[PDB]
Write a protein that binds this DNA or RNA. Structure first.
Ligand SMILES: [K+]
Ligand SMILES: [Mg+2]
Ligand SMILES: [Mg+2]
Ligand SMILES: [Mg+2]
Ligand SMILES: [Mg+2]
Ligand SMILES: [Mg+2]
Ligand SMILES: [Mg+2]
Ligand SMILES: [Mg+2]
Ligand SMILES: [Mg+2]
Ligand SMILES: [Mg+2]
Ligand SMILES: [Mg+2]
Ligand SMILES: [Mg+2]
Ligand SMILES: [Mg+2]
Ligand SMILES: [Mg+2]
Ligand SMILES: [Mg+2]
Ligand SMILES: [Mg+2]
Ligand SMILES: [Mg+2]
Ligand SMILES: [Mg+2]
Ligand SMILES: [Mg+2]
Ligand SMILES: [Mg+2]
Ligand SMILES: [Mg+2]
Ligand SMILES: [Mg+2]
Ligand SMILES: [Mg+2]
Ligand SMILES: [Mg+2]
Ligand SMILES: [Mg+2]
Ligand SMILES: [Mg+2]
Ligand SMILES: [Mg+2]
Ligand SMILES: [Mg+2]
Ligand SMILES: [Mg+2]
Ligand SMILES: [Mg+2]
Ligand SMILES: [Mg+2]
Ligand SMILES: [Mg+2]
Ligand SMILES: [Mg+2]
Ligand SMILES: [Mg+2]
Ligand SMILES: [Mg+2]
Ligand SMILES: [Mg+2]
Ligand SMILES: [Mg+2]
Ligand SMILES: [Mg+2]
Ligand SMILES: [Mg+2]
Ligand SMILES: [Mg+2]
Ligand SMILES: [Mg+2]
Ligand SMILES: [Mg+2]
Ligand SMILES: [Mg+2]
Ligand SMILES: [Mg+2]
Ligand SMILES: [Mg+2]
Ligand SMILES: [Mg+2]
Ligand SMILES: [Mg+2]
Ligand SMILES: [Mg+2]
Ligand SMILES: [Mg+2]
Ligand SMILES: [Mg+2]
Ligand SMILES: [Mg+2]
Ligand SMILES: [Mg+2]
Ligand SMILES: [Mg+2]
Ligand SMILES: [Mg+2]
Ligand SMILES: [Mg+2]
Ligand SMILES: [Mg+2]
Ligand SMILES: [Mg+2]
Ligand SMILES: [Mg+2]
Ligand SMILES: [Mg+2]
Ligand SMILES: [Mg+2]
Ligand SMILES: [Mg+2]
Ligand SMILES: [Mg+2]
Ligand SMILES: [Mg+2]
Ligand SMILES: [Mg+2]
Ligand SMILES: [Mg+2]
Ligand SMILES: [Mg+2]
Ligand SMILES: [Mg+2]
Ligand SMILES: [Mg+2]
Ligand SMILES: [Mg+2]
Ligand SMILES: [Mg+2]
Ligand SMILES: [Mg+2]
Lengths: 50, 126, 119, 149, 207
RNA sequence: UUGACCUCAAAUCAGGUAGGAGUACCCGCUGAACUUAAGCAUAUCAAUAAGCGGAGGAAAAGAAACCAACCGGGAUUGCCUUAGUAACGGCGAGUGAAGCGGCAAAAGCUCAAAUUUGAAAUCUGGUACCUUCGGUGCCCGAGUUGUAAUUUGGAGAGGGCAACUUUGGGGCCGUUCCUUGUCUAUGUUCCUUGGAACAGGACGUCAUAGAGGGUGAGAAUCCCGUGUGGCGAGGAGUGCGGUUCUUUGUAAAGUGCCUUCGAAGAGUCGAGUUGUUUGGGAAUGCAGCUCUAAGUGGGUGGUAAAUUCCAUCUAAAGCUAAAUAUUGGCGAGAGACCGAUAGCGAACAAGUACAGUGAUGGAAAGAUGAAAAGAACUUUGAAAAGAGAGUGAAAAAGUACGUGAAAUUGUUGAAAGGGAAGGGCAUUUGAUCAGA
RNA sequence: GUCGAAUUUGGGUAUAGGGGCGAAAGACUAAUCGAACCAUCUAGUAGCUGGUUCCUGCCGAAGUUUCCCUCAGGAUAGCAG
RNA sequence: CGUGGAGGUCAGUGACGAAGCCUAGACCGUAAGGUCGGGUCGAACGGCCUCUAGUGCAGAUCUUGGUGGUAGUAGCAAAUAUUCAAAUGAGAACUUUGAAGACUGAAGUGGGGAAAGGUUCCACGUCAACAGCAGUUGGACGUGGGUUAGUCGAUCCUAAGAGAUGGGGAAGCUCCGUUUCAAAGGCCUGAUUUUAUGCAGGCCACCAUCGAAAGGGAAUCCGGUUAAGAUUCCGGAACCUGG
RNA sequence: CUAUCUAGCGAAACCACAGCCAAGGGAACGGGCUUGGCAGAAUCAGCGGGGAAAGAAGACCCUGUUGAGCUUGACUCUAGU
RNA sequence: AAACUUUCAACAACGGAUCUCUUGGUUCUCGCAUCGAUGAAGAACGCAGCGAAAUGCGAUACGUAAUGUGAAUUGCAGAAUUCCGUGAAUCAUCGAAUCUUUGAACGCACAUUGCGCCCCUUGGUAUUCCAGGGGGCAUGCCUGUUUGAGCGUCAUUU
């Protein structure tokens, strides 16, 4: 809203920091059934609902 | 032929315990038998493999090949022996994972704790 | 190889405070270096050394306070035994072994005897 | 739903009966547990027959008064006539029942007699002596069986 | 599980929506929404007539009928043709029933117990096991039933002076007290003619 | 004016305690309707679901104001019975206990009401010291509107006589139990197949170990374990077995006879009425209101009442282990169970992604290979990729990865075809094929 | 149509399901209204509709009687194995 | 007849290839089915005697998943409109620049904000997916950068109202009530300064708290600066509050 | 501006199997059956006769010992008073 | 005759059935009893050389201390190979600590990372203003302490 509470900004900061693809050195680990970031969010597809 | 109520004959539990064994239990899981000469010299049959042990491959395609342990890759349930490798098509070399139950220890890497382990298992002359 | 708690334990609190200050300066300069140098794992050692020095300092302080409070009742609650809350609320051994004078007399007079059948 | 010539049934299953269905799968486990508990209780208590001496007693309700059976405990009168105090009998392994009363000299004499036999067939260990281990026998009821007069 | 298939708030959409009337998961957004529920025909639904623990598992049998069967199985162990028909390679073996010395009851070691069984001629029936061992066909093999094999001799004794432990490691071999003879051992698979090796004390205690 | 007392306050006074979670089982409150009655209202569902309060390892109950009617049993609880019975019920649908008997487990008790009155003998706290789950001294305080000792109905108490018998806790090491550590057998012998031997064959070994798992395919003997024993470590506790300092105590308890007594719970019992509830029926329990006891009394004795007996207990105060419960928690062992649309919703970063304002709703999704050896290098292409080369046992295993069905589809091959196609009987023709 | 007042509208706030709110249409109360949504009771009941999974062999019906708050159902007798 | 699992047996089959699958190839059975050959495949499985069941599908507007014909079909036609050249690029109707033609026409298709969103802002790289054509472009993808306040807001005040306490109700979750039937008080100071406190002089109380980024309200402007911040940064010049 | 044709992109409804008639009989209005008429690949734009076309387990009517909204000295109750 | 349509086969597709796997579920049995104001369960936000999650943890942040074992961890990097050692480890064990903001949640509030008060201390002349550091301030109830109130009330002076 550009006049946001610190709580909202903090959740926004966490979302920005976790908005990234899978680290590519994962998928080299020994067993590693993890293929991709299945929790990837985008502002155009799914709303954070705060 | 188990008698105690504290041991399980369940295949699922056994496999879970094996595959989720921590590093300290994997050390024991990865024991290797001594060679004939070392079995005579130490009076014991098998020992948990160590990184500087010298081993001879007795099973598999690498049977007869010898070398020194490069790594005890406990996470992979395998050991890597120097100069027992796979040459790739790009010129690189990669270690061959071997299971210690398919090797014989031909020369132990000794220290105070290894000697104490020998004597605790019933080893003669260190 | 980082600091060792058993070596720190032989040092006075002044030396430990000084070592903590030096370790903090070292960590600050190491995280300055990390901005240029990629993949600098040496900072983990200094972080663990700072943790170890703080651990030993707190050990010494808490031991001194335990000595201060030795023997007298009313120790500080974080120095008292942390059993469960119900276990700390439970009757002590002296209580729940308290018996009336009547009960003491009668159970002294007629305890459970040891007797076997022999035919 | 009244069909062909069949007896009228009274199956009471109109409540949520499946919420309370106790299948005794643990019958054998509970038997093993009862035997284990008996063994540890026998080992825990001093050499002592795992149960108190019970009196002989007539069942009520003429359907059953023709037979005799073990009662709860010996009456105060029976214990006194056997020469013990109730407290000491309770400590040396005799069940005492202050509620039961003696109106039958036959039963009274029988209970006094089995009390005397118990006293003559038990050895009480002194609290401060040696009393060498006396080969605990587990059943007082088997040792002093109730006989039908 | 008594709640399997019913951990949903599904309701039927009713008629008028061109779909079957089976109850359907409400809500939206997940793919499970709108799916059939609670039906034995429905994926993820509750099975028809869910199995219940109060099914009858053990079966009462008249004590006298059980003893009739045990006596019949004991008598069948003495018929060489029934023993041969029931596997039990007794061809070059002396008179059946096979009664051995009571010394067998006191053998402590598996080596000498196996030697005694071979000497009294159960060698072919011991070798039937150690050679019939095969992986079980089907899903029972990962339900702690991984291997199958034939039944060897049933050694029957009057007193256990070590024979039980000496023989418990020999595959296929079973040991029984003559006092308590198991029908499940005397007629395996409801097939009469178990190959039984009686000690002399057990044989005289049978009467 | 001073000093109390009583009652009531305040303090960030000294020290504590309660809340919330979990909630499978447990103790209560509150409380339906769907349903059944072929309708439906009493009834049933059900003294259940939902809601609320409160515990524990169990809870609750529990040592009779019981059951009985017997030749009497004797706390409670649980099982088998009683018994689908007595009884309840539009006596319809339905419902429905208890006594006895067999068994599991067993365990018994304590306050009030008593003048210590030649001695508040009792106790919290503070403080100093100590051997600190506490002790001693001292000092405030609590308390006579009653804290100790003594008694609990089975009794028991006050007096008189007679004697006899018995006894407390800490030490040290075992033992019991709990949590743990470690050691403890036998082939990697030969031949064949295979990428791999753990397969088949031969010759052996151990077996109180041929459970189970791993290792490049079905491994007792390669590894871990398994079996049997040995050797330790740290605790809990006095359950009990010994050794030793203690020595409790002319303290405490029990026992006989004689005598005088013998306190035993009140807006409670009980009664009326109302409501609910129960099998309890002129009223089973519970609760509200009104009435409201007694002391050779009172309660119960399953048909209301008067009268006369009898039997059996002793309420209106309290504690108590086990046998009993346990879709929760922690730790274990199993299965004629399911085998990825199954089995929990979830075998996987599943109560996740995602939907909804919200309460809530809630998926899909396992498998290269023994090992990445995950395709160096060449070539065409802007590239993706292709063609080669190569790795591999296999690329008819290339991460769009085990097998790889069907629907549906491409190509090739064959055949037929004037407004369906498919089918039956029979034979021609073409293709194809077994049998002697 | 109306367009300067019974005006339009933001935000804050209050009213909650047999309840609200209604210049009243049973209107509106989050695409839901002649009783919202969510979960549970609940797999509610259905004399009614649909479906009900291998082969062969032998035998083989009834739609009629009486009674029923019965007339799309049941009991009963009959027919059948 | 067939299926999953179970006891027994055939010392059954099997990495020299189990199961599965495909096969207008063969055989047996009236049939349910059974057997064999060939191909594919890779680790188990079967005959018989019995045991057992979550045991046989064409349908249920059946459930889940997958796939068709329809069909390269319906269609991708509101908001006046595009064109030329160059550059870039493998590729340009759509990108960039220039030129032209137009439109919004200040009640804007302009410049800012509130709610909401949450990084979409900006730069660099970059086109597998997405932008229902395309794409070298993008609100996409990948990696980073970026939001600077005594003066602008919140913060403070009270509004409709919400809501502890004291009390009362309710079995209870909780409800009522908001100054009420309450012993609800701190801020001042002569003295005390054994210490600016306690005793001890004296003055004022019908009362928590929450509730507005549009109401009320202390105080900042201009110029410049960034890829992206500006009444916030820089330069200069002020002001208010507390001390 | 579509429709149309092209490059690119690319759904859905619906679908037992399908698709030429006349009469017959037939569940009394056939695409199939009988008897006749006939009948020649593959198609494009239109079209609205037919497919008793599609959309929806008819909302009217009846039945059910299925409800619900509403009313009333229906039966039985109940807050309040 | 092609094309087209249909049928079958082979190869290739589509799709993910079948088969075989199984660190999962489910049911049965056995044993045990241990959450929280000494701050629980739950939540938010952070923490790694390179992590988005899961898991672990709390500014001592995939952990510190202690003990045991005895040489690893591993995807890369780095370190180390003294590793015959108070010593590797994403090991086990776990008794000492740390434990952000919260939460029954406790100074008052909370759609605010809002606003006080007390004590010690540090800096700015500074008891008073501002700031930094440390330690505190919820409610009900109980025992006790201290200070009090009431002609409720006793005694004494009077
Ligand atoms: K209605
Ligand atoms: Mg949008
Ligand atoms: Mg299921
Ligand atoms: Mg199979
Ligand atoms: Mg205090
Ligand atoms: Mg029901
Ligand atoms: Mg009904
Ligand atoms: Mg009905
Ligand atoms: Mg009805
Ligand atoms: Mg409930
Ligand atoms: Mg507890
Ligand atoms: Mg118990
Ligand atoms: Mg209790
Ligand atoms: Mg009593
Ligand atoms: Mg009783
Ligand atoms: Mg009967
Ligand atoms: Mg009932
Ligand atoms: Mg006495
Ligand atoms: Mg071994
Ligand atoms: Mg294997
Ligand atoms: Mg009384
Ligand atoms: Mg009630
Ligand atoms: Mg009582
Ligand atoms: Mg009690
Ligand atoms: Mg599943
Ligand atoms: Mg797969
Ligand atoms: Mg292959
Ligand atoms: Mg495949
Ligand atoms: Mg196909
Ligand atoms: Mg109307
Ligand atoms: Mg059903
Ligand atoms: Mg016929
Ligand atoms: Mg009638
Ligand atoms: Mg019909
Ligand atoms: Mg099955
Ligand atoms: Mg095959
Ligand atoms: Mg075919
Ligand atoms: Mg395989
Ligand atoms: Mg089925
Ligand atoms: Mg089908
Ligand atoms: Mg059908
Ligand atoms: Mg369908
Ligand atoms: Mg479908
Ligand atoms: Mg078109
Ligand atoms: Mg259009
Ligand atoms: Mg236009
Ligand atoms: Mg331009
Ligand atoms: Mg215009
Ligand atoms: Mg214009
Ligand atoms: Mg941009
Ligand atoms: Mg496009
Ligand atoms: Mg494109
Ligand atoms: Mg971006
Ligand atoms: Mg301002
Ligand atoms: Mg309120
Ligand atoms: Mg405010
Ligand atoms: Mg304003
Ligand atoms: Mg800007
Ligand atoms: Mg400035
Ligand atoms: Mg016609
Ligand atoms: Mg006609
Ligand atoms: Mg037609
Ligand atoms: Mg014709
Ligand atoms: Mg034609
Ligand atoms: Mg048309
Ligand atoms: Mg038409
Ligand atoms: Mg209809
Ligand atoms: Mg309809
Ligand atoms: Mg009718
Ligand atoms: Mg109605
Ligand atoms: Mg904390």
């Amino acid at each position: 809203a550009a006049q946001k509470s610190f709580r909202i900004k903090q959740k926004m900061a966490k979302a920005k920091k976790q908005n990234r693809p899978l680290p590519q050195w994962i998928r080299l680990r020994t067993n590693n059934t993890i293929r991709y970031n299945a929790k990837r969010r985008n502002w155009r597809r799914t709303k954070m609902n705060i | 032929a188990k008698q105690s109520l504290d041991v399980s004959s369940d295949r699922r539990k056994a496999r879970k315990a094996y595959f989720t064994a921590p590093s300290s239990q994997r050390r024991v899981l990865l024991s290797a038998p001594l060679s004939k000469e070392l079995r005579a010299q130490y009076g014991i049959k098998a020992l948990p493999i160590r990184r500087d042990d010298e081993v001879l491959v007795v099973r598999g395609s690498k049977k007869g090949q010898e070398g020194k342990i490069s790594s005890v890759y406990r996470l992979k349930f395998a050991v890597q022996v120097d100069k027992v490798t796979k040459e790739k098509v790009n010129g690189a070399s990669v270690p061959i994972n071997l299971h210690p139950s398919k090797l014989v220890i031909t020369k132990l890497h000794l220290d105070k704790d290894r000697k104490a382990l020998i004597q605790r298992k019933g080893g003669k002359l260190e | 190889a980082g600091v060792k708690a058993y070596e720190l334990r032989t040092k006075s609190k002044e030396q430990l405070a000084s070592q903590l200050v030096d370790l903090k300066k070292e960590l600050a300069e190491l995280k300055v270096q990390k901005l240029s140098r990629p993949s600098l794992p040496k900072i983990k050692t200094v972080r663990k050394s700072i943790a170890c020095v703080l651990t030993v300092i707190n050990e010494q302080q808490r031991e001194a306070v335990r000595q201060l409070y030795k023997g007298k009742k009313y120790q500080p609650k974080d120095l008292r035994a942390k059993k469960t809350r119900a276990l700390r609320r439970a009757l002590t051994k002296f209580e729940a072994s308290q018996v009336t004078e009547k009960q003491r007399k009668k159970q002294i007079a007629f305890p459970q005897r040891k007797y076997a059948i022999k035919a | 739903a009244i069909s062909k010539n069949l007896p009228i049934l009274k199956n009471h299953f109109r409540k949520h009966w499946q919420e309370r269905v106790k299948v005794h799968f643990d019958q054998a486990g509970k038997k093993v547990s009862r035997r284990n508990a008996r063994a540890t209780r026998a080992a825990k208590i001093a050499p002592r027959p795992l149960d108190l001496l019970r009196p002989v007693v007539r069942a009520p309700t003429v359907k059953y008064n023709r037979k005799v059976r073990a009662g709860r405990g010996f009456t105060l009168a029976e214990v006194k006539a056997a020469g013990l105090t109730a407290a000491y009998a309770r400590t040396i392994g005799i069940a005492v029942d202050h509620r039961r009363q003696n109106r039958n000299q036959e039963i009274f004499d029988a209970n006094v007699q089995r009390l005397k036999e118990y006293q003559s067939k038990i050895i009480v260990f002194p609290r401060n002596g040696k009393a060498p281990e006396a080969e605990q026998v587990l059943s007082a009821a088997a040792t002093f069986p109730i006989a039908q007069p | 599980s008594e709640k399997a298939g019913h951990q949903t708030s599904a309701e039927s959409w009713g008629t008028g929506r061109a779909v079957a009337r089976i109850p359907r998961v409400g809500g939206g957004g997940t793919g499970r929404s709108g799916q059939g529920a609670f039906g034995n025909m429905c994926r993820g639904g509750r099975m028809f007539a869910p199995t219940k623990t109060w099914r009858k598992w053990n079966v009462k049998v008249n004590h006298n009928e059980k003893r009739y069967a045990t006596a019949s199985a004991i008598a069948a162990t003495a018929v060489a043709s029934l023993v041969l028909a029931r596997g039990h390679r007794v061809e070059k073996i002396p008179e059946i029933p096979l009664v051995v010395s009571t010394d067998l009851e006191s053998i402590q070691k598996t080596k000498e117990a196996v030697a005694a069984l071979k000497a009294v001629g159960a060698h072919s029936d011991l070798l039937k096991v150690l050679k019939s061992k095969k992986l079980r066909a089907g899903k029972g093999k990962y339900r702690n039933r991984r291997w199958t094999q034939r039944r060897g001799p049933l050694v029957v004794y009057a007193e256990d002076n070590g024979i039980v432990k000496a023989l418990r490691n020999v595959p296929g071999v079973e040991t029984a007290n003559v006092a308590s003879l198991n029908l499940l051992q005397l007629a395996p698979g409801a097939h009469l003619g178990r190959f039984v090796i009686w000690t002399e004390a057990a044989f005289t205690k049978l009467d």
